[PDB]
A paper describes a structure:
For the flat cyclic component, we used a ring design with 12 repeats (R12B) constructed from curve units, and split the 12 repeats into either 3 subunits with 4 repeats each (C3) or 4 subunits with 3 repeats each (C4), depending on the desired polyhedral symmetry architecture. We then fused linear THR arms onto each subunit constrained to point outward parallel to a radial vector emanating from the symmetry axis, but offset such that when the C2 interface is formed, the C2 axis is along a radial vector. For tetrahedra (T3), octahedra (O3) and icosahedra (I3) built from flat C3-symmetric objects, the out-of-plane handshake angles that are needed to join the flat objects are 70.5°, 109.5° and 138.2°, respectively. Tetrahedral, octahedral ‘cubic’ and icosahedral structures with C3 rings at respective axes (T3, O3 and I3), and octahedral structures with C4 rings at the respective axes (O4) were constructed by incorporation of the appropriate C2 interface. Designed geometric features including the spindle-like twofold handshake interface and the flat ‘in-plane’ ring areas with distinct holes are clearly evident.
Here we describe extendable linear, curved and angled protein building blocks, as well as inter-block interactions, that conform to specified geometric standards; assemblies designed using these blocks inherit their extendability and regular interaction surfaces, enabling them to be expanded or contracted by varying the number of modules, and reinforced with secondary struts. Restricting helical geometry to ideal straight helices with zero helical twist in principle considerably limits what types of structure could be built, but this is more than compensated by the great simplification of downstream material design, as illustrated below.
Numbering used by the authors:
A (entry chain Z): 2 to 237
B (entry chain V): 238 to 695
Write the structure that this text describes.
């Protein structure tokens, strides 16, 4: 049990380091990279405490470091700040989602599952807020938010055994939609239309995923919880 | 009392010394809890006071109050941590140990929060914060009884990062890169210590636990290495650039030497060596890209050769699979070849060219002597031997093309044959299948011929 006590202070320390760098720094790209690496580096402690796969965690950390190197190389080249920030955020998003997806497999216990879900939800909400604060390009911000929300929906769906393809299809559609939004932006299309299309596709995607989850379920109180979660997602 | 001082004292150095006195004395009061030797508190107090007096004198000499503040707070954090850890040693009670550790964490938090306001220099402020956070994590980690060597090594890493940061601040670099370096390495260190603690609680086997240290040392080293070249690319002074290159190379080499000494598993050590060789080679090549006087270039080459040999020698001391060892030392040697070739392209006079060509030829020859001294099987030794003969050929001819005149060329004409003969003769003393041995000696008889024919072509 007490391993949770260890992980708590470890994570708090990592967050403090992130904040200190955020205030002390004087260059946006470096600040983004610092926080990006710190958050993922921290999450591994919680994953390890639950008994997650160690090799997967190490690989995820390596991937985060590689993303940071790529972004630093681009910024030294004088590349656009917006693209680099979006790339770093998206890489962190997939990495953290992968860690959560590995952790979800560790055990059948509802209690551990609830703990994992809560951890993932808190991290996702904080990340969405931070990205909304940093990214200036409208389409980039919108797509970041949509990707985060969709990933959170998939994470929740895992807790009830819903089909994985029900999530994968929405992820593919969302990736196609974000690529389409970037293409329309490059095509000179009106921004408002791109944002509307993105949000509408995201809405239908999350709706379909949640509906499939509700169909797959057979527990009343589980259905009530799913309804509450769907309401929260729609509100956001 | 410290609050009043920090609120109302008008001078930064005076405030720093005031809060340092308050914090040290309050740490002593905390230490009074459980009978730990009073001499420890006396020593910490005396160190704090003498350092404060020295800083005040330097300020009276016109030195920067910011540097004095950073030094004073560094000493304060060190003293608080040392006292708390010694208190942790004075008892066997688990609950007492974790309570003491929580109080020590609170103290570290307080000292760090106090530091962030007083320190005006962004780089020094970042460094102080990193120092405090690292020491806090380590002092806490001791509570559960993990080996102290790992914590000491992590402290050493943090300290080396701080040393590099202060050196670059003296160099006058852009503050953003340095702040990123400090905070990034601090995060890596903190998460590494936490992960090790987690493994300890889980009661993992040491063959598993060691892996995390290798994972951490690689990233930390590469993280500092990457920062070095970013900073160096914006400098303009040759002496300063060479100083940065040599200093960082030496520091990274020392850290890897320590880590390789500590770790105690085969595959982990193999991978760690494989990564470290590349890290140092890349840093050396990056430094070599910038111009220098011939002697400055020669010093850079000499340092790199010393480092790669030193690491390889370290691995030789360790039990490890024969084939993996051969690949490691063969692969390492190839890196020396490349940097030797890259450096040779920049020279413009025979004296340096001949000296470097001979030096690398000897160095590359030497390493194989050690590897062959412990190879476990004939086939593994043979393959490594063939590669060695081929390697020295590439070094020889690659130099020959740039060589100026026969009066110089005679030295390589002699030394290449000498090296080939030494390698072949040393390989002849080992036990191996005669048919393979004949082939190996045949290749030696072959390669020297072309070297002589190319040399004959003035």
């Amino acid at each position: 049990e007490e391993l949770r006590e260890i992980a708590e202070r470890a994570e708090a320390d990592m967050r403090e380091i992130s904040e200190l760098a955020e205030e002390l720094v004087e260059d946006p790209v470096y600040a983004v990279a610092v926080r990006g690496m710190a958050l993922v580096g921290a999450a591994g402690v919680f994953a390890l405490g639950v008994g997650g796969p160690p090799e997967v965690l190490e690989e995820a950390r390596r991937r985060v470091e590689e993303a940071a190197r790529e972004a630093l190389r681009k910024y030294e080249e004088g590349a656009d700040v917006s693209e680099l920030v979006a790339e770093l955020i998206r890489e962190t998003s997939r990495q953290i989602a992968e860690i959560a997806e590995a952790t979800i497999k560790a055990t059948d216990d509802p209690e551990v599952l609830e703990e994992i879900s809560e951890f993932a939800e808190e991290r996702s909400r904080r990340l969405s807020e931070y990205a909304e604060r940093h990214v200036t390009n409208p389409i980039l911000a919108a797509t970041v938010v949509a990707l985060a929300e969709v990933l959170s929906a998939v994470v929740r769906a895992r807790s009830y055994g819903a089909p994985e393809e029900v999530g994968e299809k929405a992820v593919k559609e969302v990736r196609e939609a974000s690529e389409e939004a970037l293409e329309r932006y490059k095509k000179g299309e009106d921004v408002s239309e791109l944002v509307a299309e993105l949000i509408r596709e995201t809405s239908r995607q999350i709706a379909e995923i949640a509906e499939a989850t509700i169909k797959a379920t057979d527990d009343p109180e589980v259905l009530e919880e799913i309804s509450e979660f769907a309401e929260e997602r729609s509100r956001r | 009392l410290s609050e009043y001082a920090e609120r109302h004292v008008t001078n930064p150095i005076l405030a720093a010394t005031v809060v340092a006195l308050a914090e040290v004395l309050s740490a002593v009061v905390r230490a009074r809890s459980y009978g730990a030797p009073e001499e420890v508190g006396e020593k910490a107090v005396k160190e704090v006071r003498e350092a404060s007096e020295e800083a005040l004198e330097r300020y009276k000499e016109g030195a920067d109050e910011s540097e004095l503040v950073a030094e004073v707070m560094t000493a304060t954090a060190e003293a608080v941590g040392e006292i708390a850890e010694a208190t942790i040693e004075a008892t066997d009670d688990p609950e007492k140990r974790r309570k003491i550790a929580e109080f020590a964490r609170e103290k570290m938090r307080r000292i760090r929060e106090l530091a962030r306001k007083l320190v005006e220099d962004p780089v020094l402020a970042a460094a102080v914060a990193a120092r405090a956070l690292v020491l806090s994590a380590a002092v806490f980690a001791k509570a559960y009884g993990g080996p102290e060597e790992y914590s000491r090594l992590m402290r050493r890493w943090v300290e080396k990062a701080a040393e590099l940061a202060r050196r670059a601040r003296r160099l006058g670099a852009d503050e953003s890169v340095l702040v990123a370096a400090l905070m990034r390495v601090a995060a890596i260190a903190v998460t590494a210590i936490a992960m090790m603690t987690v493994m300890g609680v889980q009661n993992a086997p040491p063959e598993e636990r060691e892996r995390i240290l290798a994972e951490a040392t690689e990233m930390i080293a590469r993280v500092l290495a990457e920062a070095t070249r970013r900073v160096m690319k914006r400098l303009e002074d040759p002496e300063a650039a060479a100083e940065l290159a040599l200093a960082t190379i030496e520091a990274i080499t020392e850290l890897f030497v320590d880590a390789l000494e500590i770790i105690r598993s085969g595959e982990v050590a193999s991978r760690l060596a494989k990564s470290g060789i590349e890290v140092i080679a890349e840093l050396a090549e990056a430094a070599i890209e910038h111009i220098d006087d011939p002697e400055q270039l020669k010093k850079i080459v000499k340092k790199a050769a010393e480092a790669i040999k030193k690491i390889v020698e370290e691995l030789i001391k360790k039990d490890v699979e024969d084939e993996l060892l051969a690949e490691v030392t063969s692969e390492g040697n190839r890196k020396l070849s490349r940097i030797t070739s890259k450096a040779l392209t920049k020279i413009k006079d025979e004296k340096a060219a001949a000296e470097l060509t001979i030096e690398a030829i000897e160095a590359i020859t030497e390493n194989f002597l050690l590897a062959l001294e412990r190879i476990k099987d004939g086939e593994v030794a043979a393959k490594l031997a063939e590669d060695g003969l081929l390697e020295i050929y590439r070094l020889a001819v690659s130099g020959i093309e740039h060589i100026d005149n026969p009066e110089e060329l005679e030295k390589i004409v002699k030394k290449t044959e000498e090296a080939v003969e030494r390698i072949v003769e040393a390989l002849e003393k080992k036990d191996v299948e005669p048919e393979l041995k004949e082939e190996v000696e045949e290749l030696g008889k072959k390669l020297v011929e072309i070297v002589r024919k190319l040399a004959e072509r003035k």
